[PDB]
Design a protein around this ligand. Structure first.
Ligand SMILES: CCCCCCCC(=O)OC[C@H](COP(=O)(O)O[C@@H]1[C@H](O)[C@H](OP(=O)(O)O)[C@@H](O)[C@H](OP(=O)(O)O)[C@H]1O)OC(=O)CCCCCCC
Ligand SMILES: CCCCCCCC(=O)OC[C@H](COP(=O)(O)O[C@@H]1[C@H](O)[C@H](OP(=O)(O)O)[C@@H](O)[C@H](OP(=O)(O)O)[C@H]1O)OC(=O)CCCCCCC
Ligand SMILES: CCCCCCCC(=O)OC[C@H](COP(=O)(O)O[C@@H]1[C@H](O)[C@H](OP(=O)(O)O)[C@@H](O)[C@H](OP(=O)(O)O)[C@H]1O)OC(=O)CCCCCCC
Ligand SMILES: COc1ccc2c(c1)CC[C@@H]1[C@@H]2CC[C@]2(C)[C@@H](O)CC[C@@H]12
Ligand SMILES: COc1ccc2c(c1)CC[C@@H]1[C@@H]2CC[C@]2(C)[C@@H](O)CC[C@@H]12
Ligand SMILES: CCCCCCCC
Ligand SMILES: CCCCCCCC
Ligand SMILES: CCCCCCCC
Ligand SMILES: CCCCCCCC
Lengths: 458, 458, 458, 458
């Protein structure tokens, strides 16, 4: 029992000396790292092209359909007069009708097939307003039924829409919906696939502020083209190989975990006979490996489905595959732990981690207090403090010494509007930054240094 | 006396074991944190909408009334010729007269009601110049009576103002004042309130430099609309709940403080009989809690007043509520002090703090010297060094390693204009940054590390 | 001798106890700090207005005289065709002739008074080209006499200049020179002074590259107006007070230094009788104070001269006064050295300084090597690496973690043009940053920590 | 043998005392540093002018030939309609034909001389499309022969090209090729050399996305002009001097290395008679010096060739000379090692280096995992995460606290598009930055501090 236990805790070289078994798990893990990384690289290279295609088409659509659009204007693009809004709407519809003659791309029209389109219509120009909308600011009176009514004109591909009359006082928004079909030629070494872009142009008046932002958005539905012919299954084979490798690694790691648990039970029983501590038998690296195996297998199944155009959940698949790749590359640290000079460093980090996490809790409460205060006080005056997540991002960047002067300068242009708020912002920023840079970061350094001293001088 | 004293200093668990009293203050403080944070979140969410409404309306006004205005041009927007100035003024007035036909918002005119408007006038176009303004640079002569005369034209809502004749040589400024009434519809789940925007357009010639900056500013007066009807008091109840919670906490903390003071007096008297040290009986956490309670109660009273449209002091109320929320979240640290592993870190910070503050004084004198020198020498040549507060912000950012290269690059464009100043700027910046990064920050680290060693090895 | 020596080294409180002399030097130094700081603040506030006036006038000139100018275009403003250049020149001259009718400022013309103007001329339009300039790139031939000929047209204030014929193939540059007189009215609480702006517009063809940059520059000559009359000497009195205070402090510090030297001589002689070490008698704080006094007196004399319009050397005066203010505020540290808890920190810095400077030399050689390498290799491809001073600024900013991603991104757009250079840039940047952040800054921290330990545990 | 060995390891001063030989190598190394640095400075100053000339000419070409071009638009400059593309092409060709009349530079046409030009043609306007290109997105069908056909029109210098008909549906790209000859006059104190700019304007449709980017690129071929005549060999002599100095240093260092090896062999043999450790006889500084000598000699030979216009490999020559200069300036550290106080610091760095490199490996695996995960997950949504090298640059900048807030803000505008991806980005960024700033950098500091303590307290 003592000998078996001592064998259970030997290093790979010691195990090889003791029993001579060729280490299959280590070579399997190396092969796993290689194949998982290659799969991720190929997947990312393939996804990059599709992302570029979608983005380029969307930029072209913005230039084609948004009157007076220029690059970099997305956030501020808006209308401010009734004639501006009418001109933008009519320009978008006219450009839709002129597309085959003017566009550098090759687009096919799509008709019908559900709402908001009718059977024969390619473009839907829809206006949404309030059911009852009496508003008289002169007498400070209003009578509103907030129920939204939609009235929408249908345009067939090549002027009734030219008679649009907007209900400005009760207008909620205006939308233009249409679909364009194109073939992704640049895929050529894949076979070109068929894209359907659904384009939505929104003129948004929900704020009722006299400023109506204009935006264009696209959703791309990708399918296989019916009759592809390019003059003159390794990906699937590689996915199968990855799945098989991860399954074998999973089985071996599960067997190791089960044997460890059995030895733990035997040891506990023997000690009870003779007479947190049990987790010593749990190999955390194997738990990490099993988790990465499961993530990789799920992600590869989803990747197979996506590459066949049967699925479109890119986000979840990418998150699974990326997290698993991160996990395997982290697990590479296990190998370095077997050599004394590297183990010194890894053990220092391990012994430091608990106190680092506790201090992280201590820091978290103070940080949250500062976040709330800054959001309530500075949010009305500072673009970086509008929302709580933005406030947290700004404060975290300040801790790391990024974007500090611009944060101060934004407040600089309020010293006359509100002296009290400017003074408060000075105190708030200086105190936060000084406390975190002089004291908190220094304490993290001290914790790591103390851990290192403990490791070096037991 | 020894028993009572030792009880006074026990931890909550020890006190519970000793006397069995259910801890009311701890649960009360947890509930207080919850309710104060929720109140702050609701208040901030409500204020965000009003801020957005005001800002969007002001952006729309800039686009409507400022001839040739574009986003991002606020700081440089100016006129440089007499025809430019006349065109800007006349465009603003014409747009005011055309507003009902062109604007995407719904605005009502406001007439009369005090200065600068006369009884029936909606817009005031006022020109301010010097009483006597003879200026003859050809002979280097001038005869100025600096008393400002105001001549102002009155315009009724739907062209005498077209006959404006500006006294350019003695002109101080030109202003356009008018008020617009609108209803904030997007409040819909509140009831829409009625806004009166007072719009001031300023053409500023106080520098007499040939460049006249143009700006537009708004003040919003919010009130309840007279006849609001939306087809089909929890906030006030929550405010009352917060006030009650804070009052109960205040009473309990005050009782604890008074009992501590009484025990302190008894101990001092007994020691005097037998025979800075007194503050040991003062519970600082309770002083913090009492301060937080007072701030929260004041801020909640102000918040109740504001939400009824009876008050408009958003800045003070927000500062009070935010500071109190920061204080309660900081006071959460007291709970962590009860567990040994967290108390190690908190005690390290506490023991470090005095020396950190002393070194802050030492740093302050040197920092102030650098601020003064940089302001006097570089201010004529560097945008970041124009005022003392700006100089301090720039230097503090440099200490934290932000905005360093742009600070150097601004000086790069003067190596030919003044070699001496460029060389001085090199020495100044390099010496300041090197001194603060190699030595000062390192000493803060050393202070924290020494405190940690003292705590870990008593 | 022992008693006198021990008295010479006592602290101010010990000296006061020993002999009872009221400390005049300390109160004098406090008063000096106050008066010098107030003088600097008043000087800077006064110089800010003049700087703003000059800059605003120059911006107005750019908008008035440079065809198609817009804010932020200074660095890229250039002509690229012959008609563009002709139009820019003629627009500048026409605007000069139209100035009284169109400008928002009030400017008087200046005629004659030296070169390049003739007696009756207000504007000089001068063209500089090569004496002999045959250039024939078709046959790869050229015959050039590089001697510069200047031909310049004279324009009187209100079209011979319209017949300008530029020698494009041998053109060196074109310049427009003219002077405008204005009165600085915004000085009103001073008396307005008279400004003469000399305006130089340069069309620069020295690169002969097909691109001719266009710039406008001004020199302002300020004088007192002949007949100033504003309807209804404390600065000079304050300057005299500052000079007197600094002179008294200088005399007292010099007396202290002389007495210290005398005691040093007596001690050395007595030791020689009985039987770097001498500098222990030198009070470094008094050397600093004497330097500050001298700088302040010189700067105040220059300030008096400048404020009377008898001098125009603002740079030297500002450098003197700012450096002296920095020195006095640094000298404030002497007072903190008298209290033990502050002396701990100051002594830590003092004991650390020698090793910090030695490591600075070690760092300097490696830093200079990297600067040379980066300048030679990356300068052809990277805007931040064009000159050696720019390279040093970029590397120093990288050490402090500023502007790092943009430095990488500029190189990103060369991975195709030159793979070798891009790879070298990767190695260069990563190695430099890693070496300086992991090792150098850490060693500075270690030096400070070791000094602190030595001070705390003698 | 003991005496000779002890002499081999003495310092220069000890060797001078022991044998009196005047140290030739040290003075030679000082002279080498001086001459190598001067050579590098002169070379860089000369290269700067050529770089500026090429860049200015290219900017002029962009302004002359690209319709509607403005500075800073290089990355987004593109066409979006067929008429836009036709206008850009025709404008470029028309400007080429009008160049002598409109350009501010002096350019000669180049005719024929290889492809794509025919014998008498100066400009080649070439269109590249697919051999067979049927694309019908309406029926989701396509028939493509991806073989590229080039059809190109030839234009002689002063309209057949006006009849260009683009095959938009199968268009791959359009290119305009032409060469211009100019003389670099600003070289005047060199002799002007003759430049041939080959200009390529690309209209790129490889993405087939409806957006066609437009770019202009130049290659400069520099030669000596046939008949240079400027009215009224030190560089080569200096290059020869540098080569001779480096050769002498190489010979002396090689002799020292050989003698060290001989002594090592003798010691090993004697010890074997009596009875990693051998490298103690290897002087690493001499290996560094020999490497720098070789690099300098190669770079100087290439520099001589380049300055004669016989070579054009600026990149390799610059890399060689810059690396050698960096190496000699690093080797300056050897001299500081001879003085005890500097040797303390250098020895601290030397003893720290092995553990620093080991921890660098440990950090590398985790860093690579994060790089892969970020590339796969965020690349579709974040501009900074498009490629792996860009991801690494972004993460490395984040470690150093640069460009943090903008990285967060780019993700901020996806909280609605994909909540899962935004949450993942929050976790990813916060965890990465916290781990590297609290723990990794702290451990580097601890390693350096421990090394320093070991050096200071043996
Ligand atoms: C539940 C069934 C799981 C699958 C069958 C498992 C059969 C199986 O492990 O045999 C031993 C070898 C090596 O397997 P491998 O896991 O590389 O080797 C084991 C580990 O080294 C383990 O230590 P840790 O890694 O630290 O836990 C050690 O205790 C075991 O010795 P012990 O038995 O004396 O305790 C080894 O046998 O395994 C293969 O070579 C698998 C590939 C070929 C067969 C593939 C069949 C699909
Ligand atoms: C001035 C009047 C103040 C209000 C009345 C005070 C009556 C009152 O405290 O009773 C004890 C409990 C618990 O009150 P609470 O403050 O939670 O409990 C006390 C604290 O634990 C205190 O320690 P520290 O917290 O460290 O100072 C301890 O010394 C006291 O024991 P001791 O007396 O033996 O010294 C406790 O009684 O209090 C409630 O349960 C209030 C809510 C219900 C009643 C609300 C009435 C409005
Ligand atoms: C393979 C042939 C190489 C060239 C001839 C080499 C002849 C040669 O070194 O003579 C000694 C002096 C000084 O040469 P230099 O290298 O400055 O001096 C030697 C080094 O100090 C060496 O120590 P390290 O530097 O630590 O290795 C030391 O061991 C030798 O003493 P030892 O002999 O007792 O062991 C010295 O002679 O050298 C010149 O003064 C060269 C310039 C004048 C001659 C130029 C002729 C082209
Ligand atoms: C305009 O004059 C100033 C403006 C700011 C500051 C000072 C003087 C002097 C003390 C400074 C403070 C900014 C914040 C600090 C640098 C703290 O981090 C430590 C000392 C502080
Ligand atoms: C253009 O060449 C330069 C330009 C600057 C510097 C050097 C060489 C060499 C010494 C450097 C200095 C910049 C500032 C430092 C990095 C200090 O922080 C420590 C050593 C200094
Ligand atoms: C079993 C030792 C600890 C390993 C846990 C996994 C680290 C990521
Ligand atoms: C009484 C112990 C110290 C607590 C003071 C409050 C800390 C914010
Ligand atoms: C005489 C003690 C040292 C003081 C020198 C001046 C410090 C700036
Ligand atoms: C032989 C001592 C070490 C020197 C190696 C070179 C350092 C760059």
């Amino acid at each position: 029992l003592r000998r078996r236990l001592k064998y259970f805790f030997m290093s790979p070289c010691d195990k090889f000396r003791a029993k001579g078994r060729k280490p299959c798990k280590l070579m399997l893990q190396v092969v796993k790292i290689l194949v998982v990384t290659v799969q991720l690289i190929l997947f990312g290279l393939s996804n990059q092209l599709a992302v570029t295609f979608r983005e380029e088409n969307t930029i072209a659509f913005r230039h084609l359909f948004l009157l007076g659009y220029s690059d970099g204007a997305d956030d501020t693009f808006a209308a401010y007069t009734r004639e501006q809004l009418y001109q933008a709407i009519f320009h978008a519809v006219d450009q839709y009708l002129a597309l085959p003659d003017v566009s550098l791309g090759r687009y096919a029209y799509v008709r019908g097939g559900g709402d908001p389109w009718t059977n024969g219509s390619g473009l839907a120009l829809c206006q949404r307003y309030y059911h009852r909308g009496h508003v008289d600011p002169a007498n400070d009176t209003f009578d509103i039924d907030p129920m939204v009514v939609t009235d929408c004109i249908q345009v067939d591909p090549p002027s009734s829409y030219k008679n649009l009359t907007l209900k400005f006082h009760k207008l909620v928004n205006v939308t233009i919906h249409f679909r364009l079909k194109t073939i992704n030629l640049q895929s050529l070494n894949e076979i070109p696939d068929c894209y359907t872009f659904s384009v939505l142009i929104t003129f948004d008046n929900k704020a009722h502020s006299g400023r109506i932002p204009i935006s264009l958005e696209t959703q791309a539905h990708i399918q296989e083209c019916k009759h592809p012919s390019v003059f003159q299954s390794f990906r699937l084979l590689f996915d199968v190989v990855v799945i098989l490798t991860c399954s074998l690694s999973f089985l071996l790691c599960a067997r190791s975990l089960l044997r460890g648990f059995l030895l733990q039970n035997e040891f506990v029983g023997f000690m009870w006979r003779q007479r947190w501590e049990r987790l010593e038998f749990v190999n955390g690296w194997y738990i990490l490996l099993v988790t990465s195996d499961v993530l990789t297998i799920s992600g590869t199944i989803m990747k197979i489905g996506i590459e066949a155009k049967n699925l479109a959940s890119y986000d979840v698949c990418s998150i699974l595959l990326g997290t698993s790749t991160l996990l395997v590359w982290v697990g590479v640290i296990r190998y370095l732990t077997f050599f004394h000079n590297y183990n010194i460093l890894i053990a220092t980090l391990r012994v430091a981690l608990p106190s680092v996490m506790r201090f992280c809790c201590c820091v978290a409460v103070i940080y949250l207090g500062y976040c709330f205060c800054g959001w309530i006080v500075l949010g009305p005056y500072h673009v970086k403090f509008r929302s709580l997540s933005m406030v947290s991002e700004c404060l975290f960047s300040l801790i790391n010494g990024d974007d500090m002067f611009v944060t101060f300068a934004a407040m600089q242009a309020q010293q006359g509007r509100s002296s009290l708020v400017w003074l408060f912002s000075q105190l708030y920023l200086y105190s936060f930054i000084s406390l975190f840079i002089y004291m908190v970061l220094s304490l993290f350094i001290a914790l790591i240094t103390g851990a290192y001293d403990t490791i070096k001088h037991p």
